[PDB]
């Protein structure tokens, strides 16, 4: 039930350990353009939120 | 792990056949070349080579 | 010139590139940072089913 674009849900991420490699087996992933940190060098960082 | 595959699976997990062609474009006696008909050699006379 | 051919998962097609990190660019097939060459990819679902 992904929300409509005019009312987009914003899910906050609390404290955890995040590995951005299990994502690739969740969706077809047509486009993965990432405008900040490089997608490949992403498991090696810790985020404020 | 294996790659059992069926048409039922969706986009992104479909097998992409990929071939990379790697060439060492460097100073050496060339082996593979393009389709250009070589001309005669001219000496002691300003030309484009 | 060397033609290295294989077939991989679609989400990993962008991972066959110089200086990338992940399951396939660290453990399966790594491409050098100063790679010069072409990469060609397409689908193969017509028979891989």
Curated annotation (Swiss-Prot), chain C:
Binds to host ACE2. RBD also interacts with the N-linked glycan on 'Asn-90' of ACE2. Cleavage of S generates a polybasic C-terminal sequence on S1 that binds to host Neuropilin-1 (NRP1) and Neuropilin-2 (NRP2) receptors. Interacts with host integrin alpha-5/beta-1 (ITGA5:ITGB1) and with ACE2 in complex with integrin alpha-5/beta-1 (ITGA5:ITGB1). May interact via cytoplasmic c-terminus with M protein. May interact (via N-terminus) with host bilirubin and biliverdin, thereby preventing antibody binding to the SARS-CoV-2 spike NTD via an allosteric mechanism. The lineage of its organism: Viruses, Riboviria, Orthornavirae, Pisuviricota, Pisoniviricetes. This is Spike protein S1. Attaches the virion to the cell membrane by interacting with host receptor, initiating the infection. The major receptor is host ACE2. When S2/S2' has been cleaved, binding to the receptor triggers direct fusion at the cell membrane. When S2/S2' has not been cleaved, binding to the receptor results in internalization of the virus by endocytosis using host TFRC and GRM2 and leading to fusion of the virion membrane with the host endosomal membrane. Alternatively, may use NRP1/NRP2 and integrin as entry receptors. Residues 9-11 are annotated as: Integrin-binding motif. The gene is S.
């Amino acid at each position: 039930r992904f929300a409509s674009v005019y009312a987009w849900n914003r899910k906050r991420i609390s404290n955890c350990v995040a590995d951005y490699s299990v994502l690739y087996n969740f969706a077809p992933f047509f486009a993965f353009k990432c405008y900040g940190v490089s997608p490949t060098k992403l498991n090696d960082l810790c985020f404020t939120n | 792990q294996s790659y059992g595959f069926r048409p039922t699976y969706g986009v992104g997990h479909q097998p992409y056949r990929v071939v990379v062609l790697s060439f060492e474009l460097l100073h050496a006696p060339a082996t593979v070349c393009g389709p250009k008909k070589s001309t005669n050699l001219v000496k002691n006379k300003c030309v484009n080579f | 010139v060397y033609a290295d051919s294989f077939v991989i998962r679609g989400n990993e097609v962008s991972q066959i590139a110089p200086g990338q990190t992940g399951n396939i660019a660290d453990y399966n097939y790594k491409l050098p940072d100063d790679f010069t060459g072409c990469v060609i990819a397409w689908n193969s679902n017509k028979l891989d089913s």
